[PDB]
């Protein structure tokens, strides 16, 4: 499953019907990022530009003119065809074939950017720009517009209104077609192929680091080159840190490990958090911290669907973890005044769920205190998790257990759809798993 | 193998020997760098910084104060303790450690850095500051130097004098400690054993991807988290790109594949090119051309040693590329005469070695066209190519051949060691290699 | 004659009916100007902030929030009270008395703005902003925008609308109130009795400079203390010199000299031009000049009216000037084919006319080609001339002579004021008037 | 008096003495200003640059390039002529005059700079850059720098050591040649005599900016036509502002009046502050301030000679104060606990001296508290006052007084010589000046 042509050019459209007549959007590709002296990181498309373009070249501009309500089209700027810096680092699209590729009317040289941006603004009454996103994009825009300002004697005019694209563009990229859907259920089946496999590989007196190299080669076996955020292996005491990226510890024998891995498939992010006994068996201590996450995350499932929030399902997780505590004498106090106290917030710190996209922790408005109401279209993680400190004033067998369980969904007509369910997470299904794998 | 607390202050004492009394050292860490939104990429700490420390944090800076021609010492600035910012991002080494673990004498806090740095500037006659090399860097150095400038009534001076540390400590770089010989070895062993897994690996009909993500699972399993720059994966007319990193094609039966993949190892690198044939038979054709680029190797292996340079060993090169492509038609004429002319220019456009170290196209100066003579300690890759164009004017069975093979060597008393002939490059090796993996 | 605080009120209030509900318009004064070293040049604020202000003080913003259709307010910033910054540097008028003082509804420290402008921001749909007005302005407004966007976990959202409220103010301009065209008129007195000095003080042997002194005293002597632009006094070949400044030679008898000198009195420039003999008599020559640029003055203020344009004058100047060259042989040819020609441009190489305000070349939309049409309320120059190089290929005696004669005017219901007619322009009455005073 | 082209060239010569081999010293021109909108204030050079040219145009950059110990030369970067440009803003030097007329060995365009300077610096050790001095500038420098570090394959080098000149040239400029005294002696003479001006025009009913208009005026007719600083014109309490520039009010009958003016004259400036009735008769209680103040100056004057401090007069002209504000009953107890406790501060906040050259407060090193020992061919001011604020806890009669007189001296083998003594400060010479100009 992939984003074709034909609905990058319907994004477009359905920016340009938003658009006032008389205006243009400029969307300005990433930069190239040095890695170090002379080497530069992967390149990574802003997600913006490819949500409008499907193009992975940097120096890239996407500008949309809208000359009226009924007349519109676009340029793009990109590299021109060179053929020694093609030998030496790679193969460019260039301006001939740019057209039919992607779908636009025009494209010119970006060496050529300062000298034809202005033109194509001139006159014109709104101009869109993510002003701040970018320095090189916000140097281009203001030249352009200072060129207008002061050409007026040259009879040119700049536009006085700029409008940030961001908000119109970001409640687009929140509702998912159908199309994006099969992409991001890709993402979560590979996503989870790799979460299985780093279950059926752990073994005490592996490093961390090893469990993130077989999620790796598993991403990449399905096509998915890239994790869409930096893997998360964190056993015992460093489950308890949230982006614990470190990766660099030995797995003992009696401790958890918690796995927060994702791809990145055509752009895409799959996001999953498994824990699991290293040794494959759940001490009673862990197996009951665990219980309380689970239950939260099941309960959230059965809940999350159009007409309620991720406000008013943390709500119920709070009541199951609080209930949970108190049960194991971690909280003290009684259920409701404990639940008012926010009493969990020592264990449980963070968000129950975000949005999810061509940006891991994706781009939308989620409303005050993340009330806004679910739709369908609309794509979440639900990640509850338990962190108890080493030190923290609980019994004793718990102190060091980081546990998070986290699933992607999406939000239907009906309830909701998990992407991610192909990896298990019932505590007696995680033993069966890993005792066979033992076994071989 | 790796570098120690005790290497690292032997590099600072061995800076600050070579400093002016009455001057301060200021050498500043790799900024994060963001991957898309709030996504970041993996750290990499730049490697200046890196060679003084040992340190992979960001917002950190070393200062090194020589008072005089006997006294000295050194102060950091690092992030401090933060229980929230640890919990959620990592733990941090602060200030009540450093000074034992990283052996310096001081440590403060990296908030404080502008109530502070011009304390430690004042009075000095000598800054040392790599200037233009990031921009948070020189806005914090030219504030410091700005306050002590215009200070007069409060008794403040700026030093007068800045000097760019980068040319001393590139030279320092250039002669590897026996230590970094070792783990550069290391490195070595680790990229042969990710080519050799590669060539095993490699069927008609497997993506250019797949072996890259056999690389790094590889250089992975061995504590080589990450490589070393972008691994390229060239099989057909991609061979003839010589960073091609798109790696997005399906390998055919019939085409060659070139490799260039290293990894990073404790900060080094190695690199390491292998180029051999997609179905494990050379055709006729394809061993032509490749014999010719491994008697470039094997004679430059041979030849480097104390006393030479690249430049002549280039020469040397330079001479079997011509006579070979003379033998094949692919060329005509005079082999001095096609030599004098640069004829090999258009087959072999780049250089045949460059220093490796803690950057794979490593710092130091080589002299005009790669003139310098060289000495025991200095590390260098030995990378002859040819590449034809699918629309060279050349016979038409060599059009879309791209073949590289690239070793990694240390210059000895006594000539060299190669650090990656554990990875096979005789054509029948290549090819015994192939077969005895494609039988199981 | 004076604007007031009530007219400063009705201008803020005249922007605030032009804005959209739920906005802000922020206005910024200039910054304080380096002269050489610690000293600083006299400070002019600049004329936007002036015009809604009336307030002399840099590290000031005004800030106009538009709530909804009939709720509005005004928010100035400015430099807090401090009894030693005031010792040492001059009163500041302070957040307590600037309400009353000015007419405004708060004031708040500029020391806090940006803890305080992005309060006043949120929430809003459009922000009014001259983006690359003045860099300190840009960072303070990006600034704050950066916070409200990145800070919807508080509930902060910024306004996605920014619009330059450049054209909508210099429209305002262009119309001059009643109280504003007092002011002018004044200017226009002040800035006559000057010329009128400056003939009467004239001698040969008396430098450039000289004159320019008589001039700023007579300013001053009224009460507009400054120029509102660097006095042109150009003898001889220096009067073939535009915006020649230098005023370094010594007057020669025998030669022309031209004034171009205007007052900036409570804000508001005069700008004149008299040319006149050095030695109080003009030869035929430059009579012969003079009459031309004359003629071409006295039928452009014969002209000048509602319902005509720059343009439409400037073609009536033309043909006077080009039928004038012809009859004394500068020009060669059939008038009407050396009007097709331009062939006046290299004797009148500038425009006739340019708006006159707060800025002596005033802000206001000219139309292609100064084709506006003209209304009452416009204030603008008349300023032919005529400029003979040393070496043009004209008969001898014209060889040196520049001449500009400029009065400024009021475009009114029946025709147009002259505010400058009380410095004699006819060569008869020039004559007359420096044989008077050469006589004394 | 002035400054010729032959002292410009030994300046530069001297400069070239104190610089390394293999160096180059980048001596930038002030930017252009702007004053509103389109207009700029009158340019003023860089006083450096002045200091090493005596020339009067923006964008220029001196080049002193010291190739070895024996081998130097100069190259001017300078705007080239151009007829359209020079016709409508003045006449530019060029480049094909300014190897006569400047006394540098080469001059280029400074349209050509990029392309050229790092051609300049190309192979050498030191660059002498005045880095922070002006954006612009250091820009420039580095992307010349940038280019040669970056350009080893073009085998280009830059140099690694960069050395503020500021210090070495302003110590040059802290010891003045006799040329420099003479033309600092004619700015004195000037001064005064706008000063005798202002005292003999005054009157009671003028404004403070009427006796501005006066010294400005003469100023002028004797060839300085900028003032040096802004002038401070402070009657009644406006006096007890130390830069009080506004000089808008009505001067009283019964009020003194405060005038600290000073000329600039080929680049160097006068400083004179006077102070008196502005009815022509001091008033008991104002010559009682008044007697304390002229005390501490004539004493000054006495004392200032080479091998004694502004430190060691200061402390002189403190007891004084201290001594005669005791006597009036303004300060109360023990004169030396007084001394001891600073207690002249409230009323005498200032330095008694700063440096006097081509910036009114000049560059020099003054050592800790202005300790530095004088010798000959130092140039200062010397300006007691007394500062008596409206609300002070003192005598009523004193309140609202504000006293300064100043003096330009430089200091000889013998002594000083006093610049600026042409204008009375005697208060019965004062009296009886005023009285016989109150008669005409
Ligand atoms: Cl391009
Ligand atoms: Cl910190
Ligand atoms: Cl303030
Ligand atoms: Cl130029
Ligand atoms: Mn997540
Ligand atoms: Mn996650
Ligand atoms: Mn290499
Ligand atoms: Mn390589
Ligand atoms: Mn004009
Ligand atoms: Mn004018
Ligand atoms: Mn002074
Ligand atoms: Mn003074």
Partial sequence: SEISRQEFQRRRQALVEQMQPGSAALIFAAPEVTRSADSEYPYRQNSDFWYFTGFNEP??????????????????????????????????????????????????????????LYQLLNGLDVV???????????????SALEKLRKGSR?????????????????????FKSPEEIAVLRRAGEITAMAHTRAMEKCRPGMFEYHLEGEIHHEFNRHGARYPSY???????????????????????DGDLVLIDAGCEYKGYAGDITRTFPVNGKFTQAQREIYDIVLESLETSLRLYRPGTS??????????????????????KGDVDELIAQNAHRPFFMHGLSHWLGLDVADVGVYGQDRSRILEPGMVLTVEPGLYIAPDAEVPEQYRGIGIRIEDDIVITETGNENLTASVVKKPEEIEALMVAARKQ
């Fill in 310 to 331: 991720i406000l008013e399902v943390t709500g119920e997780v709070v009541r199951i973890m609080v209930s949970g505590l108190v049960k194991l004498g971690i909280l």
């Fill in 230 to 252: 930096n893997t998360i292996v964190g056993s015992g005491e460093n489950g308890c840190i949230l982006h614990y990226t470190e990766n660099e510890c030995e797995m003992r």
């Fill in 154 to 174: 040259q009879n040119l005019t700049a536009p006085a209104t700029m409008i940030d694209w961001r908000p119109v563009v970001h409640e687009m990229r929140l």
């Fill in 59 to 116: 120096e890239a501009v996407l500008v949309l003119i809208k000359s009226d309500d009924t007349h519109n089209h676009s340029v793009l700027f990109n590299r021109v065809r060179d053929l020694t810096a093609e030998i030496w680092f790679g193969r460019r699209l260039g301006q001939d074939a740019a057209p039919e590729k992607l779908g636009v009317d025009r494209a010119l040289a970006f060496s050529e950017i300062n000298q034809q």
């Fill in 128 to 142: 869109y720009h993510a002003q701040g996103e970018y320095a090189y994009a916000d140097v281009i825009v203001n």
